[PDB]
Design a protein around this ligand. Structure first.
Ligand SMILES: CCOc1cc2c(OC[C@@H]3CCC(=O)N3)nccc2cc1C(N)=O
Length: 289
């Protein structure tokens, strides 16, 4: 039950060059975007920070309040840290600790020319992300939007789960189905709210880590990355056919171990998926010696 810092809107406007929406690569401040806001690089009290400016108005305000509420309760090595918020001015802002290496989605795509992540780094990221989800499930929270754009990477490439605006603290049904289609479990697409859906979404993240492919590509066959599990099961392809070629240190044994965890997470029947504790254990055994 943390109490956060309150920033002035105009200070956040000032330190992000008036919310300069141009990419940082061309002299602007924009680091990224979500369906509910834009992320800007800023500089407050000599510290580099990230400012998310939120863009119905009622639903957006509830997600702003939910992010603050969930962050006040959940604090862990593998969850991004909220520093403060702003609500006095024009737009709602959320301020976080700066993640120099951006999102796992952007690092897997090598966006802006960044070097590809090694298999060694990918194993640490998968372990860290599972540890963060474990902390959330232990604290009775369902994330509801696990995806590589919501796994940030700090100065040491430590995984930091982000975006708690849709998180639910507690199988139960909702009339407002939310999440990212390409990562959603079948029961989540139907309105069910359960931590088993976070496990399924984490399985799609593990396939992105192994393959370097985005969860959805309308110009690819199959369009949805989760469909490769069936191609591999029906022996039409092997996990070796899909391994990211942008690595030089992957070994078949540990890649097959990560794939086995992903396959288990992606069981269509929610009760047949492992829980997050089992996923953590399997990912630890993957690198043990
Ligand atoms: C806003 C919390 O922190 C961040 C977000 C970032 C980002 O976000 C994409 C989507 C939308 C919002 C979300 O959580 N994921 N892409 C790239 C770099 C980011 C850096 C940071 C950072 N430096 O803290």
């Amino acid at each position: 039950d943390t109490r956060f810092h309150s920033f002035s809107f105009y200070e956040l406007k000032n330190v992000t060059n008036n919310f300069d929406e141009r990419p940082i690569s061309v002299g602007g401040n924009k680091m990224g975007e979500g369906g509910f806001g834009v992320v800007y690089k800023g500089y407050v009290n000599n510290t580099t920070v990230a400012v998310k400016k939120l863009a119905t108005t009622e639903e957006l305000k509830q997600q702003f309040d939910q992010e603050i509420k969930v962050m006040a309760k959940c604090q862990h090595e593998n969850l991004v840290e909220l520093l403060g918020f702003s609500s006095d001015g024009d737009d709602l802002c959320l301020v976080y600790v700066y993640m120099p290496n951006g999102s796992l989605l952007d690092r897997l795509s090598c966006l802006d020319g960044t070097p590809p992540l090694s298999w060694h780094m990918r194993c640490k990221i998968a372990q860290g992300a599972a540890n963060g989800i474990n902390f959330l499930h232990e604290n009775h929270h369902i994330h509801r939007d696990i995806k590589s754009a919501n796994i940030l990477l700090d100065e040491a490439f430590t995984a930091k789960i982000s975006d708690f605006g849709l998180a639910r603290a507690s199988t139960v049904m909702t009339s407002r189905i939310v999440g990212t289609t390409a990562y959603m479990a079948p029961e989540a697409l139907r309105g069910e709210i359960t931590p088993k859906s976070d496990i399924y979404s984490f399985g799609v993240v593990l396939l992105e880590i192994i393959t370097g492919l985005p969860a959805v590509d309308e110009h690819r066959e199959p369009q949805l990355l989760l469909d490769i599990k069936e191609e591999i099961e029906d022996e039409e392809k092997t996990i070796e056919d899909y391994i990211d070629k942008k690595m030089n240190d992957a070994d078949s044994t540990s890649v097959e171990a990560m794939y086995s965890v992903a396959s288990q997470c992606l069981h269509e029947k929610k009760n047949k998926r492992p829980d997050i504790k089992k996923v953590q254990q399997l990912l630890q055994e993957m690198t043990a010696s």
